[PDB]
């Protein structure tokens, strides 16, 4: 069983690590944006410190280790991200080296969801603004700068509505067979694949996540059939985005990882920021550049 009192554990661990100089929060500023062409909401984060920047999980510094084991099995460590933008940003990393190009185990995806659940005690979408994204950057094109398997868990912003939400609104959880495939928003430019999840975690077992993933991965795989994709997970839904380049073309040339594809863009350069702000649709075009054409 996954550790309890987890959130308190991460938080306590975090302030301590921040206090002690073991991890450095990237200074950043974020504002909302609306794509005037596609309606998509964007959350743009400016972190110019990062423009400075041009297996760390092997023997992690002990101060960054939240739990040396996570479940009963010797399977997982939970780590603090050492260079977070969003505070308390964490890492679910395999006890033993397993490839960053490796696909997620059913227990991979299943352990993730539990971490999500530790973190939001629910009680409503209409009670709290607390909320969390799980993501996995898989393959050279996905934004992965790292080769060891790591699932990332980080707070999402308080008033922000990623397009996936509006996609799954209404829309009972299911799996593609014949009528409706995984959901795809036809307004945006990039191929992506989504399915809603049961409103109750009561209904969420390692089996359902497993099946959801695989089928999403089936549709996203056809974009090759080298191999890279993003995986996004929230309590409300799960998403898979086939991926072509790690870095967008000419207008902006943004390094985009998993976050981009729910609309959260990390910008390291002022001009680009100002360009985005002037014309938010360019984000959508960048997402095309790093991705594949929207197939909806
Ligand atoms: N010794 C160590 N101990 C613990 N962790 C270590 C570590 N060495 C590296 N790491 C961390 O482990 C993770 C590795 O996963 P990766 O998949 O390999 O890389 P990444 O998350 O895309 O971050 P990267 O470092 O490649 O580039 P970026 O400029 O986007 O990085 C920007 C950072 O902000 C995040 N980020 C990206 N987009 C964001 C957005 N829109 N909003 C908020 N945060 C965002 C990224 O996840 C990343 O953490 C990262 O979290 C990394 O920080």
Curated annotation (Swiss-Prot):
Its main location: cytoplasm. It is found in: Cytoplasm; Nucleus. Disruption phenotype: Inactivation of both APA1 and APA2 promotes a great increase in the cellular concentration of bis(5'-nuceleosidyl) tetraphosphate nucleotides. One of its GO terms (molecular function) is bis(5'-nucleosyl)-tetraphosphatase activity. Keywords: ATP-binding, Cytoplasm, Hydrolase, Nucleotide-binding, Nucleotidyltransferase, Nucleus, Transferase. The keyword tRNA processing does not apply. Gene3D superfamilies: 3.30.428.70. InterPro entries: Ap4A_phos1/2 (IPR009163), Ap4A_phos1/2-like (IPR043171), Ap4A_phos1/2_N (IPR045759), ATP_adenylylTrfase_C (IPR019200), Fork-head_TF_regulator (IPR053364), HIT-like_sf (IPR036265). The active site is at 150 (nucleophile). Substrate binds at residues 53, 81-82, 137, 143-146, 152, 257-259, 264, 268. One of its GO terms (biological process) is nucleotide biosynthetic process. Optimum pH is 7.5. It catalyses: ADP + ATP + H(+) = P(1),P(4)-bis(5'-adenosyl) tetraphosphate + phosphate; sulfate + ADP + H(+) = adenosine 5'-phosphosulfate + phosphate. Its cofactor is a divalent metal cation. Pfam families: Ap4A_phos_N, ATP_transf. GO terms for cellular component: cytoplasm; nucleus. The keyword Hydrolase applies. Belongs to the ATP adenylyltransferase family. Present with 1770 molecules/cell in log phase SD medium. Ap4A phosphorylase catalyzes the phosphorolytic degradation of bis(5'-adenosyl) tetraphosphate (Ap4A) into ADP and ATP. Can also use other Np4N' nucleotides (where N and N' stand for A,C,G or U) as substrates, but prefers A-containing substrates. Cannot catalyze the reverse reaction. Additionally, this enzyme can also catalyze the phosphorolytic degradation of adenosine 5'-phosphosulfate (AMPS) into ADP and sulfate, the reversible exchange reaction between inorganic phosphate and the beta-phosphate of a nucleoside diphosphate (NDP), and the synthesis of Ap4A from AMPS plus ATP. This is Diadenosine 5',5'''-P1,P4-tetraphosphate phosphorylase 2.
